[PDB]
Amino acid sequence: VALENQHTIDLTD
Amino acid sequence: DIVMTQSPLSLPVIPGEPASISCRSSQSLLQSNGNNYLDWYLQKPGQSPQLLIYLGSNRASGVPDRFSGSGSGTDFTLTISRVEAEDVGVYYCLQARQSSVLTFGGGTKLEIKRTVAAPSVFIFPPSDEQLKSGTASVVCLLNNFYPREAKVQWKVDNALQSGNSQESVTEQDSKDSTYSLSSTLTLSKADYEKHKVYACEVTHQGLSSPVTKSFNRG
Amino acid sequence: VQLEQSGAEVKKPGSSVKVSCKASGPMFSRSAFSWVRQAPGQGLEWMGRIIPTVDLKNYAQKFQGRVTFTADKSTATSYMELRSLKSEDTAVYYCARMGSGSSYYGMDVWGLGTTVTVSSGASTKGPSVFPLAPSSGTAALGCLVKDYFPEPVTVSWNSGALTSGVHTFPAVLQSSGLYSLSSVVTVPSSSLGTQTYICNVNHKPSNTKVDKRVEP
Secondary structure: OOHOOOOOOOOOO | OOOEEEEEEEEOOOOOEEEEEEHHHHHHHHOOOOOEEEEEEEEHHHHHHEEEEOOEEEEOOOOOOOOEEEEOOEEEEEEOOOOOOHHHHEEEEEEEEOOOOEEOOOEEEEEEEEOOOEEEEEEOOOOOHHHOOOOOEEEEEEEEEEEEOOEEHHHEOOOOOOOEEEEEEEEOOOOOOEEEEEEEEEEEHHHHHHOOOOOOOEEEOOOOOOOEEEEEEO | OOOOEEOEEEEOOOOOEEEEOOOHHHHHHHOOEEEEOOOOOOOOEEEHHHEEOEEEEEOOOHHHEEEEEEEEOOOOOEEEEEEEHHHHHHHHHHEEEOHHHHHHHEEEEEEEOEEEOOOOOOOOOOOEEEEEEEOOOOEEEEEEEEEEEOOOOOOEEHHHOOOOOEEEEEOOOOOOOOOOEEEEEEEEHHOOOOOOOOOEEEEEEHHHEEEEEEEO
C-alpha cells in the first residue's frame, strides 16, 4: 500500500 | 536505491569530551509528513543493537540527553556531548524513507581514548588432561591494556615460533576501557616434550621494554 | 525477553534454515518485524520486514527470491526462512520490532539473535574444557574451551557469582575447522589457597554444560 510505504497510515490499524 | 555513508570508520575520544559522527544519504530522507527517516543505533560489545535516535533527532526512551541527533535531507550528525566508558561500541545510521526499504550505514566504532596502560602478562602451561589426548596448548594472556596495538612473540628454547599460534582480542571494556589479548601456541604432545623453555614475549607502548613470561617443563 | 528467537543452527551449503521470533500477543498485532543479519566482524544488513497482521512482506533486493517470511497469528510467532545457503550466510540473524508506516519510530525492540553457521562439516561437537592453572598481588586463571562447533559458547564463573575481572575472548577457527576459546579471570593472589574457581561452559548446539574446577 502506497500510503503505508510513505508513512501516512499504519497497516496494523 | 539509497546508499548510506557513515564517517569516520573509527573515532577515538578522550573521556568527558564530545564526539561527532556523520551519516550521508544518497537521497533526501525528508518525507511529506516533515520527518527525516534517519535513525541511529548502538551495538555494545556482545549485545544486540539498540535504538538510540529515531527519525533524525528523537531520543529513544532511557537514552541520556548527552546523545543528540541533528540534520535534515541528506546530511545527519550524532553528537555525544560528553563521551563516557559505557558508550563504547559501534554506532550505525539507518534510513527508512520508504517503510518497505531500510538500509544501514557502514558503522562507526567509538573508541574511548583512556590513558596508556601496560598489559599484565601471564603464561599458562597445558593441562595434564589435555596432554593425555596428544596435543599441548600453551596460552599467553595480556590483560587490561591500552591502546590495542600489541605484539606477542612465542619462543620455544629461545627459537622464534611462527605459524603455530592464534590470538584474539576482546572489545574495549565498558568499565575501564582496556583491551585483553589471548594467544594460544599449539604443538603436538611429542613436540612439546622435545623442548624445555616456553616463553611469551610481549611488546606494548606502555612497557619500558619487551616483557617475557616463561616456564620450564614439557 | 520481549522477543524470543530459536536456537543456533548449523546447515550444509545449499540447504535451508528457518529462524523464529516470538512476541507477545499485543506486540505481534501492532508491529512490523525486521530481519537484520550480521556476518562475523561485519556490520548490520537489513534483509526485509513482515507485517504479520496484513501478511505483508518486503524483501531487500539482495535477498529477493531465496528468503521467505511467514507468520503464525495463533502463536504470535514470525519466521525467516533462508534457502540455498552459502558460506557468506554464516551470521547472527536478529529479529527487530517496529511500527508500520505512520507508526514507525525506529526498530525499538530487538531479539537476542540466532547464530546460523553454514558448513559442509555440519556436525555439532561439544568442547573439551581444560584448566588454565594459576602460578608463575594479582593472579590469573582460566579455562580453555577447545575443539567445539558451531558457535556460540557462553562461559560463567562460579555459576555467575564471579563477574569482576572476567574476560571471555572471541573464539578462533583452528586449522581443523573447530573453534577454540579461552576465558580468564584475575583475582587476589591471596585467594588461590582459599577460594575454589569453577568455569561453567555452555554449548547449547550440543546441549553441553561443563563445570571445570581450576586448581592452582
